């Protein structure tokens, strides 16, 4: 039941913009929102890409710092760990946000400003500083004060990565890179496209897969 | 829809033009704009007709005999002739003229030199065509070559549309007799369309329209331009379009 | 106008197809001669060439020279040309 | 004016009906109608009839220009010693002639039949 | 949507009519849209219609009424003579002008009547036509006399200085065989859409 | 030669400081020099008279052609004047989109003779062409069609110097607008050819056809008094307007015609 | 090349053959010169360069003429779900539906080709033969243009008795060993019957369902869609629309064949 994309279709995220995102948002073990902002500030390359980076820095500034930091803290941990534990962690941090003991996540007021009161104008914020790592952990972790538990499924199963997503969507850059490496141990773009668009039985008739592969090749590999 | 073909080293051409004969602007005027314009006109003429599918040369050959739809013929003729001219010009895609070609020339022009032949061609160009036109060095079913001038969009291929001399001005007795003979030959053809057989092939087309020279050489100096073109042309291409 | 649709038939065919060939030349000449002899008495020389022409025609045999595929087409195209509803 | 109905890629086209003369499409009543529809959409002419008239008037000028082009091209050809073996009217006459010849022999035979 | 595409598309563009393909009455202008193929498309029997068209048809042009009928055949006739009449008229180059003192309709609820000419001529009357021999004053056209004269796909009224007996009376009702030259004076167009030409017999 | 144009400052309407020179001053020089090279005489005299003298002659052909070229250009330029529109040096050159633009000649009308007197001329034009707009369309479209070296001519049918009816004709490379000088040359050549053949019907029929084409409604021959010329050659308009701006150029020319001169040229009617 | 060409003397003009060769050379090098013609339909190009099932759109189907159903008066109401509306006294086939069914059909064609099944392309109409043969060539498959003798599958031993059978690798190499007379006489049934005019050969369809063979058909607005396993709604009368669908199917089967060959090589 799919259909091809129109002939005027252009992939919104250009190559230079993707490259600058890669440069900025990739972080080490102890990365921060502040570090990201610094990276954005000091990026150098294409003029359009620089303008984009500036724009995204501006919109980060506009948004709340504490929430962004919390999200940053969550995401690395979630990437490391398995689904159920990640869900539990998310639930715990939501609970903490709801019942802020330390008073360091101005959430309910911000929601009122936005959802209840008025759509226009951003919230001014009343808390802007670099939270400590221990504090961040406490924010996104449980305690014996309140009992917490997810509702039991029929299939009470736990896994580190999705069992059925990878087959039935467009193939990640990482998978393409792995394939290229395997091929190496000549290689060319057309051959790669054929492999992805014909050989793989789950991804034979994927819609914009060849274009994606071409974009990936443009971005990463060289002649 | 008819669109202009991608020339080899196009970006380089755009930057420079052609080393000796045509400037960056002058080359744009003759090709990157004028050729495009011609193609657009041809498309407009032949959008919904059966002619849309055919190439310019094949369109011209189809159209040649028809008195009406002469506009289509003219456009098609121009497009083909202009691209032949550009092909002749191009630096690459140093090459000398072929030995076979030289031997053929010698056979044709009473054992004269190639420089002499060039000089005769430029003289013909100067004298024959007033206003616009084309200057071909052609080869016919008799293996000898000859010089063929055309007055605006006259094709070297099909002799009834050679468009070789202007009856707007006064003409000679010999020319008139030749015309009469041609007409007779045409009448002798005996087909429903009424189209004779002809096997004339162009070897060196030159563009005597103002779209080539006028920017660089001014309103005069068309002869000089023609000479320059003759001096610096793609010889490999010429050699390729010579042997049977 | 009033259209007339037939029912489903076993086989559309004309019982006898007429070719409609031209009438014989010799017969025509004979008729002309007869007409001439009605006038001008029995055998006057006004019809001198006509009799000769008739003789020339009817020298080898009494007549000089000696089918339309319409059924094959009807038979071919009946099933198409029907307005017979689907199966 | 003959019409080719065998479609070229319907997806490939991209006509701005700001004007009539599109590239892949020829000049015809269709183009007029498309122009009328465009006018209606844009509300330059709120009324449909007025938009139609406007489109018709745009078409007419283009047609006149086309007509002039061909005639002048023919004139040019005549001037510069081009030779057309069979003109359209001459062709038509020739076509008529064969039919007439066919008729004549048949008609004579029919008259002979009638006589006898 | 699909519906929009259908409305745009080349079969929707052909305006429908159920006029007779065989009309033995008076034909003053084209009845049906002429439809051509390319040679390639003809070779594989494709005309851009509902069905394939019979391989018996070798002409590139045709006329039709129904894409498909109850008889399981497209109602068509393989002929496009009307284009040739128009082309002949163009060749003749006699510009149609309204003999009544009126403005040219192409310059400046619905009127179904024919707007000026039906589009056989968008030529304007003021031009001359030069040639090698000179400026053509009198338009020379070959035609056939019927009894009126058939002149390049149009019947035309005729006039002359003296009625020539040698050509006429030698073959009284076989005048159609011999082609005579004509000088076309002018072409008027009446309300019914008939082109009323007027010629003059040359000898 | 002309007064209204000069080398330093061209017309504000049509041409530019360099483009005008390319169109006119250089061309004229080229032609005159060529004419001098051909003929030992340096006396200009009239051009028309020279053409009449040397017409119907293959030996004296080139000179005639050069005279025609010179005369036609001069005739074109005499008609022209200044304009309201901006110079092409300021404006941008038209691209491939110019081809697809609908012309406004059918609907719009501008710069008529009536606005600067010239009433009788306008009436004559109307009589000839039905209307002013119709005339304009006939003129401009014809000029566009020429596509090459040529000239569009508004003319008057000479039968005091009386005239019958106004007309318009195109003429190419170095063709004269006067019919009488070249009328029946082809027929004469045909006759000569027939004589030569005899020395060594269909031909008679062709001759008869030629004769009837040539001869008018009454008089032995016909001639045309030119009132307006408009050049069609790339030489003029390629410099300013580029390839695609021929129509624009023609429009500009039309806007900037001095109709008083045309009216003066127009003789009395019968 | 051209070993028997007797070339004319240098003093003499070109011979007829020599002239023809010169013309051919000109055509190859410099005839298709002046311009290039983008966006135009060549009939042959649909047979030799059909698009993949993915890249087909509704617009392409409409251009092909697949949307044009039989007629308003020749309506099998069994086919009601497939039809979009009526226009010009003709039912018009819903083309999104057509697309989805075509894709489904294309996938099954690919699958049987991959498995190494015998695909059989049946097309009794006049112009269909050449394109049918091309499709059959594309996948290592079979076709029928000259009429289907009733009982090729049901009564196989009588009809298809005296024709040569073969052996085949995991690749498509003849591996020419002698087939035993017992080994030869067994029926060789198709694993996909694909018809271009199911309304004209009901019989073939009936034997397929008796003989237990899945079948694909271009169901027009007068055809029974229940008579086949995988109906593609569309215009079976026009030659070019059929070719387009058929060519697509061939391409799908070709792909599957290529994949099978690749996995054999592996
Ligand atoms: Mg059917």
Curated annotation (Swiss-Prot), chain B:
Transmembrane segments: none annotated. GO terms for molecular function: metal ion binding; structural constituent of ribosome; superoxide dismutase activity. InterPro entries: Mn/Fe_SOD_C, Mn/Fe_SOD_N_sf, SOD_C_sf. One of its GO terms (cellular component) is mitochondrial small ribosomal subunit. It is found in: Mitochondrion. One of its GO terms (biological process) is mitochondrial translation. Pfam families: Sod_Fe_C (PF02777). Keywords: Mitochondrion, Ribonucleoprotein, Ribosomal protein. It comes from the Eukaryota. Component of the mitochondrial ribosome (mitoribosome), a dedicated translation machinery responsible for the synthesis of mitochondrial genome-encoded proteins, including at least some of the essential transmembrane subunits of the mitochondrial respiratory chain. The mitoribosomes are attached to the mitochondrial inner membrane and translation products are cotranslationally integrated into the membrane. Present with 2060 molecules/cell in log phase SD medium. Belongs to the mitochondrion-specific ribosomal protein mS42 family. This is Small ribosomal subunit protein mS42. It comes from Saccharomyces cerevisiae (strain ATCC 204508 / S288c). The gene is RSM26.
Curated annotation (Swiss-Prot), chain E:
GO terms for molecular function: structural constituent of ribosome. GO terms for biological process: mitochondrial translation; mitochondrial translational initiation. Keywords: Mitochondrion, Phosphoprotein, Ribonucleoprotein, Ribosomal protein. It holds the Pfam family Mit_ribos_Mrp51. The keyword Mitochondrion applies. Changing residue 183 to R: Suppresses defects in the 5'UTLs of COX2 and COX3 mitochondrial mRNAs. Changing residue 165 to R: Suppresses defects in the 5'UTLs of COX2 and COX3 mitochondrial mRNAs. It is found in: Mitochondrion. One of its GO terms (cellular component) is mitochondrial inner membrane. Transmembrane segments: none annotated. Present with 656 molecules/cell in log phase SD medium. Component of the mitochondrial small ribosomal subunit (mt-SSU). Mature yeast 74S mitochondrial ribosomes consist of a small (37S) and a large (54S) subunit. The 37S small subunit contains a 15S ribosomal RNA (15S mt-rRNA) and 34 different proteins. The 54S large subunit contains a 21S rRNA (21S mt-rRNA) and 46 different proteins. Belongs to the bacterial ribosomal protein bS1 family. This is Small ribosomal subunit protein bS1m. The lineage of its organism: Eukaryota, Fungi, Dikarya, Ascomycota, Saccharomycotina.
Swiss-Prot record, chain F:
One of its GO terms (biological process) is mitochondrial translation. InterPro entries: SOD_C_sf. Keywords: Mitochondrion, Ribonucleoprotein, Ribosomal protein, Transit peptide. It comes from the Eukaryota. It is found in: Mitochondrion. Present with 2840 molecules/cell in log phase SD medium. This is Small ribosomal subunit protein mS43.
From Swiss-Prot, chain G:
GO terms for molecular function: structural constituent of ribosome. Its main location: mitochondrion. One of its GO terms (cellular component) is mitochondrial inner membrane. Keywords: Mitochondrion, Ribonucleoprotein, Ribosomal protein, Transit peptide. It comes from the Eukaryota. It is found in: Mitochondrion. GO terms for biological process: mitochondrial translation. Component of the mitochondrial small ribosomal subunit (mt-SSU). Mature yeast 74S mitochondrial ribosomes consist of a small (37S) and a large (54S) subunit. The 37S small subunit contains a 15S ribosomal RNA (15S mt-rRNA) and 34 different proteins. The 54S large subunit contains a 21S rRNA (21S mt-rRNA) and 46 different proteins. Present with 6890 molecules/cell in log phase SD medium. Component of the mitochondrial ribosome (mitoribosome), a dedicated translation machinery responsible for the synthesis of mitochondrial genome-encoded proteins, including at least some of the essential transmembrane subunits of the mitochondrial respiratory chain. The mitoribosomes are attached to the mitochondrial inner membrane and translation products are cotranslationally integrated into the membrane. Belongs to the universal ribosomal protein uS2 family. This is Small ribosomal subunit protein uS2m. It comes from Saccharomyces cerevisiae (strain ATCC 204508 / S288c). The gene is MRP4. The chain holds residues 128 to 393 of 394 of the full protein.
């Amino acid at each position: 039941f799919v259909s091809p994309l129109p002939k005027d279709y252009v992939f919104k995220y250009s190559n230079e913009k993707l490259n600058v995102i890669e440069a900025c948002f990739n972080l080490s073990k102890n990365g921060t929102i502040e570090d990201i902002m610094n990276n954005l500030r000091q990026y150098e390359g294409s003029a359009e890409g620089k303008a984009f980076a500036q724009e995204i820095k501006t919109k980060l500034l506009t948004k709340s710092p504490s929430s962004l930091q919390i999200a940053l803290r969550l995401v690395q941990e979630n990437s490391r760990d398995h689904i159920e534990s990640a869900i539990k962690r998310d639930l715990y941090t939501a609970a903490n946000m709801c019942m802020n003991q330390d008073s360091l996540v101005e959430f309910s007021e911000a929601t009122k400003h936005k959802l209840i009161d008025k759509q226009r104008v951003p919230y001014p914020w009343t808390k802007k500083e670099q939270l400590f790592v221990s504090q961040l952990t406490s924010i996104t972790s449980p305690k014996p004060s309140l009992p917490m538990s997810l509702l039991r499924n029929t299939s009470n199963v736990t896994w580190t990565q999705y069992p059925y997503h990878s087959k039935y969507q467009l193939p990640t850059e990482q998978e393409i890179a792995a394939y290229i490496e395997k091929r190496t141990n000549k290689v060319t773009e057309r051959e790669v496209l054929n492999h992805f668009a014909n050989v793989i039985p789950s991804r034979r008739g994927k819609l914009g897969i060849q274009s994606l592969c071409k974009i990936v090749c443009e971005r990463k590999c060289e002649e | 829809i008819h669109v202009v073909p991608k020339l080899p080293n196009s970006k380089a051409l755009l930057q420079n033009g052609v080393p000796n004969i045509l400037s960056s602007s002058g080359f744009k005027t003759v090709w990157f704009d004028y050729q495009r314009y011609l193609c657009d006109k041809l498309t407009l003429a032949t959008a919904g007709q059966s002619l849309e599918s055919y190439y310019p040369f094949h369109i011209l050959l189809k159209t040649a005999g028809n008195p009406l739809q002469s506009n289509i013929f003219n456009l098609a003729s121009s497009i083909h002739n202009n691209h032949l001219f550009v092909e002749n010009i191009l630096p690459s895609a140093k090459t000398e003229p072929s030995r076979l070609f030289l031997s053929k020339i010698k056979d044709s022009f009473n054992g004269s030199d190639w420089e002499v032949v060039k000089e005769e061609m430029i003289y013909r160009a100067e004298n024959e065509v007033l206003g616009q036109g084309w200057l071909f060095l052609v080869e016919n079913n008799e293996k000898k070559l000859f010089i063929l001038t055309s007055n605006n969009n006259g094709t070297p291929y099909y002799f009834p549309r050679n468009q070789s001399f202007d009856l707007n001005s006064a003409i000679s007795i010999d020319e008139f007799a030749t015309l009469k003979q041609m007409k007779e030959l045409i009448g002798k053809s005996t087909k429903l369309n009424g189209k004779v057989q002809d096997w004339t092939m162009p070897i060196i087309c030159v563009n005597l329209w103002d779209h080539a020279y006028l920017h660089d050489y001014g309103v005069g100096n068309r002869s000089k331009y023609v000479k320059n073109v003759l001096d610096n042309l793609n010889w490999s291409v010429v050699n390729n379009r010579i042997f049977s | 106008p009033p259209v007339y649709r037939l029912p489903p038939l076993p086989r559309l065919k004309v019982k006898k197809p007429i070719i409609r060939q031209e009438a014989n030349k010799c017969l025509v000449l004979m008729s002309n001669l007869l007409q001439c002899w009605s006038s001008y008495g029995h055998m006057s020389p006004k019809c001198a060439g006509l009799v000769t022409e008739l003789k020339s025609c009817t020298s080898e045999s009494a007549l000089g020279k000696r089918k339309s595929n319409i059924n094959y087409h009807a038979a071919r195209l009946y099933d198409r040309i029907n307005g017979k509803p689907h199966d | 004016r003959p019409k080719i109905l065998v479609e070229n890629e319907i997806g490939d086209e991209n006509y701005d009906w700001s004007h009539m003369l599109q590239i892949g499409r020829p000049l015809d009543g269709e183009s007029v109608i498309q122009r009328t529809m465009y006018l209606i959409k844009t509300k330059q002419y709120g009324d449909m009839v007025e938009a139609y008239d406007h489109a018709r008037y745009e078409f007419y000028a283009l047609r006149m220009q086309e007509e002039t082009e061909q005639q002048v091209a023919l004139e040019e050809a005549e001037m510069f010693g081009s030779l057309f073996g069979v003109s359209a009217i001459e062709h038509g006459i020739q076509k008529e002639q064969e039919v007439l010849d066919v008729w004549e022999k048949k008609v004579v035979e029919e008259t002979e039949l009638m006589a006898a | 949507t699909l519906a929009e595409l259908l409305g745009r598309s080349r079969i929707a563009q052909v305006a429908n009519n159920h006029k007779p393909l065989t009309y033995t009455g008076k034909k003053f202008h084209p009845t049906h849209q002429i439809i051509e193929t390319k040679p390639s498309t003809l070779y594989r029997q494709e005309w851009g219609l509902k069905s394939a068209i019979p391989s018996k048809i070798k002409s590139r042009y045709l006329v039709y009424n129904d894409l498909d009928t109850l008889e399981r055949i497209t109602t068509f006739e393989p002929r496009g003579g009307t284009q040739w009449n128009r082309l002949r008229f163009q060749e003749m180059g006699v510009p149609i002008v309204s003999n009544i003192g009126r403005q040219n309709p192409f310059f400046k609820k619905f009127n179904t009547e024919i707007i000026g000419t039906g589009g056989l001529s968008y030529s304007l009357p003021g031009k001359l036509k030069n040639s090698p021999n000179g400026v053509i004053q009198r338009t020379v056209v070959p035609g056939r006399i019927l009894n009126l004269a058939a002149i390049g796909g149009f019947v035309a009224d005729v006039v002359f200085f003296q009625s020539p007996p040698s050509s006429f009376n030698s073959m009284g009702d076989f005048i159609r065989m011999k082609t005579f030259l004509f000088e076309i004076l002018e072409a008027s167009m009446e309300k019914n859409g008939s082109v009323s030409m007027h010629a003059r017999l040359l000898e | 030669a002309l007064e209204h144009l000069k080398e330093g400052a061209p017309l504000k309407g049509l041409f530019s400081i360099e483009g005008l020179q390319k169109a006119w001053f250089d061309r004229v020089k080229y032609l005159d020099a060529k004419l001098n090279d051909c003929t030992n005489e340096a006396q200009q005299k009239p051009l028309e008279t020279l053409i009449h003298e040397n017409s119907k002659s293959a030996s004296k052909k080139h000179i005639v052609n050069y005279a025609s070229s010179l005369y036609n250009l001069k005739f074109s330029m005499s008609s022209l004047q200044g304009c309201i529109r901006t110079p092409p040096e300021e404006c941008p050159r038209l691209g491939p989109e110019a081809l697809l633009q609908t012309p406004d000649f059918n609907r719009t009308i501008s710069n008529e003779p009536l606005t600067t007197g010239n009433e009788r001329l306008q009436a004559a034009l109307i009589s000839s062409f039905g209307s002013l707009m119709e005339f304009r369309t006939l003129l401009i479209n014809s000029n566009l069609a020429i596509s090459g070296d040529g000239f569009t001519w508004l003319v008057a049918r000479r039968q005091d110097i009386e005239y019958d009816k106004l007309f318009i004709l195109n003429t190419y490379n170095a063709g004269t607008p006067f019919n009488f000088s070249t009328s029946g040359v082809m027929n004469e050549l045909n006759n000569q050819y027939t004589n030569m053949e005899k020395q060594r019907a269909k031909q008679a029929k062709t001759k008869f056809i030629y004769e009837t084409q040539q001869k008018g409604f009454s008089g032995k021959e016909v001639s045309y008094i030119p009132l307006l010329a408009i050049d069609a050659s790339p030489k003029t308009w390629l410099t300013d307007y580029g390839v695609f701006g021929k129509r624009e150029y023609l429009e500009r020319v039309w806007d900037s015609i001095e109709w008083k001169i045309v009216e003066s040229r127009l003789p009395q009617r019968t | 090349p051209y070993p028997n060409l007797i070339p004319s003397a240098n003093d003499k003009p070109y011979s007829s053959q020599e002239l023809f060769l010169r013309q051919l050379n000109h055509s190859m090098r410099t005839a298709k010169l002046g311009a290039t013609i983008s966006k135009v339909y060549y009939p042959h190009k649909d047979i030799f360069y059909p698009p993949l099932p993915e890249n087909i759109t509704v617009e392409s189907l409409m251009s092909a003429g697949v949307h044009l159903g039989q007629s308003t008066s020749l309506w099998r109401s069994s086919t009601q779900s497939y039809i979009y509306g009526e226009y010009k006294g003709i039912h018009i086939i819903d083309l999104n539906q057509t697309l989805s069914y075509l894709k489904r059909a294309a996938k099954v064609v690919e699958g049987v080709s991959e498995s190494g099944g015998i695909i059989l392309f049946l097309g009794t109409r006049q112009g269909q033969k050449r394109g049918l043969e091309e499709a059959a060539k594309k996948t290592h498959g079979y076709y029928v243009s000259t009429r289907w003798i009733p009982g090729t599958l049901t009564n196989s031993t009588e009809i298809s008795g005296i024709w040569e059978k073969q052996e085949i690798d995991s690749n498509d190499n003849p591996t020419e060993r002698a087939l035993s007379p017992n080994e030869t006489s067994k029926q060789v049934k198709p694993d996909l019957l694909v018809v271009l005019n199911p309304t004209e050969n009901r019989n073939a369809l009936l034997e397929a369902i008796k003989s237990r063979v899945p079948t694909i058909a271009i169901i027009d607005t007068d055809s029974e869609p229940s008579l086949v396993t995988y109906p593609i709604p569309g215009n079976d009368d026009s030659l070019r629309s059929v070719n387009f669908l058929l060519g697509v199917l061939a391409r799908a089967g070709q792909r599957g064949l290529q994949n099978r060959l690749a996995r054999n090589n592996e």
